[PDB]
Coordinates of C-alpha atoms and ligand atoms in Angstrom, one line a residue:
Chain A
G1 CA 40.4 -10.4 -26.7
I2 CA 43.0 -10.6 -24.0
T3 CA 45.6 -7.8 -23.4
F4 CA 48.9 -9.3 -22.7
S5 CA 51.2 -12.2 -24.1
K6 CA 54.2 -14.2 -22.8
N7 CA 56.3 -11.1 -23.6
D8 CA 54.5 -9.5 -20.6
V9 CA 55.4 -12.1 -17.9
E10 CA 58.6 -13.6 -16.7
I11 CA 58.7 -16.7 -14.6
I12 CA 61.6 -16.2 -12.4
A13 CA 61.9 -19.9 -10.9
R14 CA 59.6 -22.9 -10.1
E15 CA 60.2 -24.5 -6.6
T16 CA 59.3 -28.0 -6.3
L17 CA 57.2 -28.1 -2.7
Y18 CA 56.2 -31.7 -3.1
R19 CA 57.3 -34.5 -5.2
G20 CA 55.5 -37.7 -5.2
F21 CA 53.1 -39.3 -7.8
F22 CA 52.2 -35.8 -8.6
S23 CA 54.1 -32.4 -7.9
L24 CA 53.2 -29.2 -6.2
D25 CA 55.4 -26.1 -7.6
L26 CA 55.8 -22.7 -6.4
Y27 CA 55.9 -20.4 -9.5
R28 CA 57.8 -17.2 -8.8
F29 CA 56.9 -14.5 -11.5
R30 CA 56.3 -11.0 -12.4
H31 CA 53.8 -9.7 -14.8
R32 CA 52.6 -6.4 -16.5
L33 CA 49.5 -4.6 -14.9
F34 CA 46.5 -3.4 -16.5
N35 CA 47.2 0.1 -15.1
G36 CA 50.5 0.1 -17.0
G37 CA 53.0 -0.8 -14.5
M38 CA 55.0 -4.1 -13.4
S39 CA 53.9 -6.4 -10.6
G40 CA 56.4 -7.2 -7.8
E41 CA 57.4 -10.8 -7.7
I42 CA 54.3 -12.8 -7.2
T43 CA 54.2 -16.6 -6.0
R44 CA 51.6 -19.1 -6.8
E45 CA 51.1 -22.9 -5.7
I46 CA 50.4 -25.0 -8.7
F47 CA 49.3 -28.7 -8.8
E48 CA 51.4 -30.5 -11.5
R49 CA 49.6 -33.7 -12.7
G50 CA 50.3 -33.9 -16.4
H51 CA 47.5 -33.6 -18.8
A52 CA 44.7 -35.8 -20.1
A53 CA 42.8 -37.2 -23.1
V54 CA 38.9 -37.7 -22.7
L55 CA 36.8 -39.7 -25.1
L56 CA 32.9 -39.1 -25.4
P57 CA 31.9 -42.5 -26.8
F58 CA 29.0 -41.8 -29.2
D59 CA 26.9 -44.1 -31.2
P60 CA 25.5 -42.0 -34.1
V61 CA 23.1 -44.8 -35.3
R62 CA 21.4 -45.3 -32.0
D63 CA 22.0 -41.9 -30.5
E64 CA 23.5 -43.6 -27.5
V65 CA 26.4 -42.5 -25.2
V66 CA 28.7 -45.1 -23.3
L67 CA 29.4 -43.8 -19.7
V68 CA 31.8 -45.5 -17.2
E69 CA 31.6 -45.6 -13.7
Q70 CA 34.3 -45.8 -11.1
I71 CA 35.1 -44.5 -7.8
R72 CA 36.8 -41.0 -7.4
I73 CA 37.6 -40.7 -3.7
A74 CA 38.4 -37.0 -4.1
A75 CA 34.7 -36.7 -4.8
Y76 CA 33.7 -38.1 -1.3
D77 CA 33.5 -34.9 0.7
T78 CA 31.2 -32.9 -1.5
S79 CA 29.0 -35.9 -3.2
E80 CA 26.5 -38.2 -2.4
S81 CA 28.7 -41.0 -3.5
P82 CA 32.2 -41.1 -4.6
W83 CA 31.3 -43.4 -7.5
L84 CA 31.0 -41.1 -10.7
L85 CA 29.5 -41.4 -14.2
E86 CA 32.4 -40.1 -16.4
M87 CA 33.8 -40.2 -19.9
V88 CA 36.8 -42.6 -21.0
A89 CA 39.9 -40.7 -19.7
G90 CA 43.5 -41.1 -19.1
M91 CA 46.8 -39.3 -18.6
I92 CA 48.9 -38.6 -21.9
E93 CA 52.4 -39.8 -21.4
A94 CA 55.6 -38.5 -23.1
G95 CA 55.4 -38.9 -26.8
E96 CA 52.0 -40.1 -26.9
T97 CA 49.1 -38.5 -28.8
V98 CA 45.8 -37.5 -27.4
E99 CA 44.1 -39.8 -29.9
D100 CA 46.0 -42.8 -29.1
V101 CA 45.5 -42.6 -25.5
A102 CA 42.0 -42.1 -25.9
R103 CA 41.8 -45.3 -28.1
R104 CA 43.9 -47.2 -25.5
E105 CA 41.5 -46.2 -22.6
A106 CA 38.3 -46.9 -24.7
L107 CA 39.7 -50.5 -25.1
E108 CA 40.8 -50.8 -21.5
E109 CA 38.0 -49.0 -19.8
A110 CA 34.9 -50.0 -21.8
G111 CA 35.9 -52.6 -24.1
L112 CA 35.3 -50.4 -27.1
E113 CA 36.8 -50.2 -30.6
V114 CA 36.6 -46.4 -31.8
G115 CA 36.0 -45.6 -35.3
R116 CA 36.0 -42.0 -36.6
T117 CA 37.1 -39.2 -34.3
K118 CA 36.4 -35.4 -33.9
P119 CA 37.8 -32.8 -31.5
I120 CA 35.4 -31.3 -29.1
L121 CA 37.5 -28.9 -26.9
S122 CA 40.6 -28.8 -24.9
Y123 CA 40.2 -26.8 -21.7
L124 CA 42.0 -26.0 -18.4
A125 CA 40.4 -27.9 -15.5
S126 CA 40.9 -25.1 -13.0
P127 CA 43.7 -22.9 -13.9
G128 CA 43.9 -20.8 -10.7
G129 CA 45.6 -23.8 -8.9
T130 CA 46.5 -26.5 -11.4
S131 CA 48.2 -26.6 -14.8
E132 CA 45.9 -29.5 -16.0
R133 CA 44.7 -29.4 -19.4
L134 CA 42.3 -32.1 -20.9
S135 CA 41.6 -32.7 -24.6
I136 CA 38.2 -34.2 -25.5
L137 CA 37.4 -36.1 -28.5
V138 CA 34.0 -37.5 -29.7
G139 CA 34.6 -41.2 -31.1
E140 CA 32.3 -43.1 -32.9
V141 CA 31.3 -46.5 -31.4
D142 CA 28.7 -49.1 -31.7
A143 CA 27.2 -48.9 -28.4
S144 CA 25.7 -52.4 -28.5
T145 CA 29.3 -53.8 -27.7
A146 CA 29.8 -51.7 -24.8
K147 CA 28.8 -53.6 -21.6
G148 CA 30.5 -55.3 -18.4
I149 CA 33.4 -54.7 -15.9
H150 CA 36.5 -53.3 -17.0
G151 CA 39.7 -51.4 -16.0
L152 CA 43.0 -52.7 -15.2
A153 CA 43.2 -54.6 -11.9
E154 CA 47.0 -54.5 -11.5
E155 CA 46.4 -50.4 -11.4
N156 CA 43.4 -51.0 -8.8
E157 CA 41.1 -49.6 -11.7
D158 CA 37.6 -51.1 -11.4
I159 CA 35.0 -49.7 -13.9
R160 CA 31.3 -50.6 -15.1
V161 CA 30.0 -49.7 -18.4
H162 CA 26.6 -47.8 -18.6
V163 CA 24.9 -47.3 -22.0
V164 CA 22.4 -44.5 -22.1
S165 CA 20.8 -42.6 -24.7
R166 CA 22.0 -39.1 -25.4
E167 CA 19.0 -37.1 -24.2
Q168 CA 19.1 -39.5 -21.1
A169 CA 22.7 -38.6 -20.4
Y170 CA 22.0 -34.9 -20.9
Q171 CA 19.0 -35.3 -18.5
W172 CA 21.5 -36.7 -16.1
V173 CA 23.9 -33.5 -16.5
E174 CA 20.6 -31.4 -15.8
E175 CA 19.8 -33.4 -12.8
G176 CA 23.4 -33.3 -11.4
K177 CA 23.7 -37.2 -11.7
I178 CA 26.6 -36.4 -13.8
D179 CA 28.6 -33.6 -12.3
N180 CA 32.3 -33.8 -13.4
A181 CA 33.8 -31.2 -15.7
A182 CA 34.8 -33.5 -18.5
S183 CA 31.5 -35.3 -18.9
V184 CA 29.6 -32.1 -18.5
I185 CA 31.6 -30.2 -21.1
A186 CA 31.3 -33.5 -23.4
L187 CA 27.8 -33.7 -23.0
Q188 CA 26.8 -30.1 -23.3
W189 CA 28.8 -30.0 -26.5
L190 CA 27.0 -33.0 -27.8
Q191 CA 23.7 -31.5 -27.0
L192 CA 24.8 -28.4 -29.2
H193 CA 26.4 -30.6 -32.1
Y194 CA 24.5 -33.8 -32.4
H195 CA 22.5 -32.9 -35.2
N196 CA 25.2 -32.2 -37.5
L197 CA 27.3 -34.9 -36.2
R198 CA 24.7 -37.7 -36.7
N199 CA 24.3 -36.4 -40.2
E200 CA 28.1 -36.8 -40.8
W201 CA 28.5 -40.0 -39.4
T202 CA 25.4 -41.5 -41.0
Chain B
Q1 CA 18.6 -46.0 -15.7
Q2 CA 19.6 -47.5 -12.4
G3 CA 22.4 -45.3 -12.2
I4 CA 25.5 -45.6 -10.0
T5 CA 26.2 -48.9 -8.2
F6 CA 27.7 -48.0 -4.7
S7 CA 27.4 -45.5 -2.0
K8 CA 29.5 -44.1 0.9
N9 CA 28.7 -47.3 2.7
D10 CA 30.7 -49.2 0.1
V11 CA 34.1 -47.3 0.9
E12 CA 36.2 -47.3 4.1
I13 CA 38.6 -44.4 4.4
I14 CA 41.1 -45.5 6.5
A15 CA 43.1 -42.3 7.0
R16 CA 44.0 -39.0 5.4
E17 CA 47.6 -37.8 5.7
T18 CA 48.6 -34.2 4.7
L19 CA 51.8 -34.6 2.5
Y20 CA 52.3 -30.8 2.1
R21 CA 50.6 -27.9 3.6
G22 CA 51.0 -24.2 2.4
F23 CA 48.3 -22.0 0.9
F24 CA 46.8 -25.3 -0.3
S25 CA 47.3 -28.8 0.7
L26 CA 48.2 -32.3 -0.9
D27 CA 46.5 -35.1 1.1
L28 CA 46.9 -38.6 0.9
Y29 CA 43.8 -40.7 0.9
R30 CA 44.0 -44.2 2.2
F31 CA 41.0 -46.2 1.4
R32 CA 39.3 -49.6 0.5
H33 CA 36.2 -50.0 -1.6
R34 CA 33.6 -52.4 -3.0
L35 CA 34.4 -54.0 -6.2
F36 CA 31.7 -54.4 -9.1
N37 CA 32.5 -58.2 -9.5
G38 CA 32.0 -58.7 -5.7
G39 CA 34.2 -58.3 -2.5
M40 CA 36.6 -55.6 -1.3
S41 CA 39.7 -53.8 -2.8
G42 CA 42.8 -54.0 -1.0
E43 CA 44.1 -50.7 0.5
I44 CA 44.6 -48.0 -2.1
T45 CA 46.2 -44.7 -1.8
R46 CA 45.5 -41.4 -3.8
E47 CA 47.4 -38.0 -3.7
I48 CA 44.7 -35.3 -3.7
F49 CA 44.9 -31.8 -4.2
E50 CA 43.0 -29.8 -1.6
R51 CA 42.2 -26.2 -2.3
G52 CA 38.6 -25.8 -1.0
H53 CA 35.6 -25.1 -3.3
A54 CA 34.4 -22.1 -5.4
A55 CA 31.4 -20.1 -6.6
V56 CA 31.4 -18.9 -10.0
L57 CA 29.1 -16.3 -11.6
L58 CA 28.3 -15.9 -15.3
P59 CA 27.1 -12.1 -15.6
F60 CA 24.5 -12.1 -18.2
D61 CA 22.6 -9.1 -19.5
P62 CA 19.5 -10.4 -20.9
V63 CA 18.2 -7.1 -22.2
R64 CA 21.4 -6.7 -24.6
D65 CA 22.2 -10.6 -24.9
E66 CA 25.5 -9.9 -23.7
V67 CA 28.2 -11.3 -21.2
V68 CA 30.8 -9.9 -19.0
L69 CA 34.1 -11.5 -19.1
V70 CA 36.9 -11.0 -16.6
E71 CA 40.5 -11.1 -17.8
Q72 CA 43.3 -12.0 -15.3
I73 CA 46.7 -13.8 -15.5
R74 CA 46.6 -17.6 -14.5
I75 CA 50.2 -18.6 -14.4
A76 CA 49.3 -22.3 -14.4
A77 CA 47.9 -21.9 -17.8
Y78 CA 51.5 -20.7 -19.1
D79 CA 52.8 -24.1 -20.3
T80 CA 49.8 -25.1 -22.4
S81 CA 48.6 -21.8 -23.4
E82 CA 49.8 -19.2 -25.9
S83 CA 49.1 -16.4 -23.1
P84 CA 48.6 -17.3 -19.5
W85 CA 45.9 -14.1 -19.3
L86 CA 42.8 -15.9 -19.5
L87 CA 39.0 -14.7 -20.2
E88 CA 36.9 -16.1 -17.5
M89 CA 33.8 -16.0 -15.1
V90 CA 33.8 -14.1 -11.9
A91 CA 34.7 -16.6 -9.3
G92 CA 36.1 -16.9 -6.0
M93 CA 36.7 -19.5 -3.1
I94 CA 34.1 -19.9 -0.5
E95 CA 35.1 -19.4 3.2
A96 CA 33.4 -21.1 5.9
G97 CA 29.9 -20.0 6.8
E98 CA 29.5 -18.5 3.3
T99 CA 27.0 -19.3 0.7
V100 CA 27.6 -19.6 -3.0
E101 CA 25.1 -17.0 -3.8
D102 CA 26.9 -14.7 -1.2
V103 CA 30.2 -15.2 -2.6
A104 CA 29.2 -14.9 -6.1
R105 CA 27.6 -11.4 -5.4
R106 CA 30.7 -10.2 -3.5
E107 CA 33.2 -11.1 -6.3
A108 CA 30.9 -9.7 -9.0
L109 CA 31.7 -6.4 -7.3
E110 CA 35.3 -6.9 -6.5
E111 CA 36.2 -8.5 -9.7
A112 CA 34.0 -6.5 -12.3
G113 CA 32.3 -3.6 -10.3
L114 CA 29.1 -5.3 -11.1
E115 CA 25.7 -5.2 -9.2
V116 CA 23.9 -8.4 -9.7
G117 CA 20.0 -8.6 -9.8
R118 CA 18.3 -12.2 -9.8
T119 CA 20.6 -15.2 -10.0
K120 CA 19.7 -18.8 -11.1
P121 CA 21.8 -21.9 -10.4
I122 CA 23.4 -23.2 -13.4
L123 CA 25.4 -26.4 -12.4
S124 CA 27.6 -27.6 -9.6
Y125 CA 30.7 -29.7 -10.8
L126 CA 33.9 -31.5 -9.9
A127 CA 36.9 -29.8 -11.6
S128 CA 38.9 -32.9 -11.8
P129 CA 37.9 -35.6 -9.5
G130 CA 40.8 -37.9 -10.0
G131 CA 43.3 -35.7 -8.4
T132 CA 41.5 -32.7 -6.9
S133 CA 38.4 -32.5 -4.5
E134 CA 37.8 -29.2 -5.9
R135 CA 33.8 -28.5 -6.5
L136 CA 32.6 -25.3 -8.3
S137 CA 28.9 -24.1 -8.1
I138 CA 28.0 -21.8 -11.0
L139 CA 25.1 -19.2 -10.9
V140 CA 24.1 -17.0 -13.7
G141 CA 23.4 -13.4 -12.5
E142 CA 21.3 -10.6 -13.9
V143 CA 23.7 -7.6 -14.8
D144 CA 23.5 -4.4 -16.9
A145 CA 26.6 -4.9 -19.1
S146 CA 26.4 -1.0 -20.0
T147 CA 27.9 -0.5 -16.4
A148 CA 30.8 -3.2 -17.0
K149 CA 34.1 -1.5 -17.5
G150 CA 37.6 -0.8 -16.3
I151 CA 40.2 -2.3 -14.1
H152 CA 39.1 -4.1 -10.8
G153 CA 40.5 -6.7 -8.5
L154 CA 42.0 -6.5 -4.9
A155 CA 45.4 -4.9 -5.3
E156 CA 46.6 -6.0 -1.9
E157 CA 46.0 -9.6 -2.9
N158 CA 47.9 -9.0 -6.3
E159 CA 44.5 -9.7 -8.2
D160 CA 44.5 -7.4 -11.3
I161 CA 41.5 -7.8 -13.5
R162 CA 40.1 -6.3 -16.6
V163 CA 36.3 -6.2 -17.7
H164 CA 35.4 -7.2 -21.1
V165 CA 32.0 -7.0 -22.4
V166 CA 30.9 -9.1 -25.7
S167 CA 27.9 -10.6 -27.1
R168 CA 26.8 -13.9 -26.0
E169 CA 27.5 -15.2 -29.7
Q170 CA 30.7 -14.0 -29.6
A171 CA 31.6 -15.5 -26.3
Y172 CA 30.2 -18.6 -27.3
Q173 CA 32.3 -18.6 -30.8
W174 CA 35.2 -18.1 -28.5
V175 CA 34.5 -21.1 -26.8
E176 CA 34.4 -23.1 -30.0
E177 CA 37.4 -21.4 -31.3
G178 CA 39.5 -22.1 -28.0
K179 CA 40.0 -18.4 -27.1
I180 CA 37.8 -19.4 -23.9
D181 CA 39.3 -22.4 -22.6
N182 CA 38.9 -22.6 -18.9
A183 CA 36.3 -25.2 -17.7
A184 CA 34.1 -22.8 -15.5
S185 CA 33.5 -20.7 -18.5
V186 CA 33.0 -23.4 -21.0
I187 CA 30.5 -25.2 -18.9
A188 CA 28.6 -21.7 -18.1
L189 CA 28.9 -20.5 -21.8
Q190 CA 27.6 -24.0 -23.1
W191 CA 24.9 -23.8 -20.6
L192 CA 24.0 -20.3 -21.7
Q193 CA 24.0 -21.3 -25.3
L194 CA 21.4 -23.9 -24.5
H195 CA 19.2 -21.9 -22.2
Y196 CA 19.5 -18.2 -23.2
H197 CA 16.3 -18.0 -25.0
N198 CA 14.1 -19.1 -22.1
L199 CA 16.4 -17.1 -19.7
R200 CA 15.9 -13.7 -21.7
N201 CA 12.2 -14.4 -21.6
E202 CA 12.4 -15.3 -17.9
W203 CA 14.3 -12.0 -17.0
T204 CA 12.8 -9.4 -19.3
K205 CA 9.1 -9.9 -18.6
Ligands
AR6_301 N1 47.5 -20.9 -6.7 C1 47.5 -20.0 -5.7 N2 48.5 -20.0 -4.8 C2 48.8 -19.0 -4.0 N3 47.9 -18.0 -3.7 C3 46.5 -18.1 -4.6 C4 46.6 -18.9 -5.4 N4 45.4 -18.7 -6.1 C5 44.9 -17.6 -5.6 N5 45.6 -17.4 -4.7 C6 45.4 -16.3 -3.6 O1 44.1 -16.1 -3.2 C7 43.5 -15.0 -3.6 C8 42.0 -15.2 -3.8 O2 41.7 -16.4 -4.5 P1 40.3 -16.5 -5.2 O3 40.4 -15.1 -6.1 O4 39.4 -16.4 -3.9 O5 40.1 -17.7 -5.9 P2 40.3 -18.0 -7.4 O6 39.5 -17.0 -8.5 O7 41.8 -17.6 -7.6 O8 39.9 -19.4 -7.6 C9 38.5 -19.6 -7.7 C10 38.4 -20.6 -8.9 O9 38.8 -20.1 -10.0 C11 40.1 -20.3 -10.6 O10 40.3 -20.9 -11.8 C12 40.5 -21.4 -9.4 O11 41.2 -22.4 -10.0 C13 39.4 -21.9 -8.8 O12 38.8 -23.0 -9.3 C14 44.3 -14.5 -4.9 O13 44.2 -13.1 -5.2 C15 45.6 -14.9 -4.2 O14 46.3 -14.0 -3.4
AR6_302 N1 45.4 -39.1 -7.5 C1 46.1 -40.1 -7.6 N2 47.0 -40.6 -7.0 C2 47.8 -41.5 -7.1 N3 47.9 -42.5 -8.1 C3 46.8 -42.0 -9.0 C4 45.9 -40.9 -9.0 N4 45.2 -40.9 -9.9 C5 45.5 -41.9 -10.8 N5 46.7 -42.6 -10.2 C6 47.0 -43.8 -10.7 O1 47.2 -43.7 -12.0 C7 46.4 -44.9 -12.7 C8 45.9 -44.2 -14.1 O2 45.4 -42.8 -13.9 P1 44.9 -41.8 -15.4 O3 45.8 -42.4 -16.5 O4 45.4 -40.4 -14.8 O5 43.5 -42.1 -15.7 P2 42.3 -41.3 -14.9 O6 41.2 -41.5 -15.5 O7 42.6 -41.6 -13.3 O8 42.5 -39.6 -14.9 C9 42.2 -38.9 -16.0 C10 41.5 -37.6 -15.6 O9 40.2 -38.1 -15.1 C11 40.3 -37.7 -13.8 O10 39.2 -36.6 -13.5 C12 41.6 -37.1 -13.5 O11 41.5 -35.9 -12.7 C13 42.1 -36.8 -14.9 O12 42.0 -35.4 -15.0 C14 45.4 -45.0 -11.5 O13 44.5 -46.1 -11.9 C15 46.2 -45.0 -10.6 O14 47.1 -46.3 -10.8
MG303 MG1 40.4 -43.2 -16.8
MG304 MG1 42.3 -46.0 -17.5
MG305 MG1 38.6 -14.7 -8.8
MG306 MG1 38.3 -12.3 -6.6

């Protein structure tokens, strides 16, 4: 496994470079080197935007997945369209749990009640430049109740529900039609675990 | 089956404003877009972290069923991880005029001392598109894991990297256990777990 621990790094200071809806911080730190020495003082720019909960809504009876479609303008420059097919997800605020956020967002974004849940994985989105961690759950849903247009208007959130079969969703990952990290991770996990999960939940 | 509903013709980007520029940038996108129930939104603003785009290389030894991991500190992991040293894929930013393949091969040498044989695309993904534009394009690369050892990275860039060789099965079990938990490695190693049988047959013929 890894070589060094938090006993091997000192964060000297963090400087807020930008404070708005999100923050950008300069971390100043020193750390042990693999060759046996200590680094000098290093600085890194880090995008601070909190952490998120992600829900894969899976119907184990029908072998169906619920996707949500919404515009993500940051996708515009490298994608055919900025509207993406994604997992239910939202930011975790102070004192909330991953699972309570997932359930609130499943209701607000897809009109879905969630039954049983299991953790998938918790991952760092891009840890060279952002602290963001996302914790994915799979949630038992009745996909026949998933339809229509959702999202909170007062937050300029406009979301369309799509229901597909599991195999169809995974085909869309293979084809590049679904290409955001949270959805790729969740649906690859589903393809590796669906036999046991469907058995557990049926 | 239809898929997504709207295209770039359905969104108007009114302006972008750089709010902060240093090594990276934070931009404010100002835009309007079509609504599903009809009509156009009002003006919306989003803060977007701009850091360019990256190439990622999963170094896979098909003879040995082994993967090469690189360990380095990622200080952004500190607040949510037991240690900021992460086990990762070879990866680097893509400079203008460069291909994903060119970057992947260069970084394999710089970060792991690895010569790469054949490559195949895995997947290209958006890291976190609600708040960053970053796209990462993953290749799998054919390597001899018996050549993978030691300390690498560019010291003049304060890049200090240690090579680890593990079995594919061990690497994937570490994803399941949360010991590997950065997106690029998770995506690449899940893909490998779904495709290694055919990939080994393809590359050992
Ligand atoms: N946050 C930072 N702030 C300042 N300088 C930095 C930073 N990150 C890197 N540098 C400088 O830039 C040099 C080279 O950075 P390269 O190695 O091509 O990129 P990558 O591997 O870091 O990022 C690639 C992906 O993997 C990661 O997970 C990222 O999140 C990306 O998603 C470093 O040695 C530093 O001097
Ligand atoms: N970039 C932004 N700039 C300004 N306001 C924003 C921004 N993003 C969201 N808001 C405001 O905050 C509201 C709620 O945004 P949240 O709870 O985070 O949900 P989510 O699904 O968007 O992001 C969750 C993850 O998925 C994505 O990939 C992200 O990268 C995350 O990783 C928006 O409707 C706006 O009012
Ligand atoms: Mg959301
Ligand atoms: Mg929401
Ligand atoms: Mg790198
Ligand atoms: Mg490098």
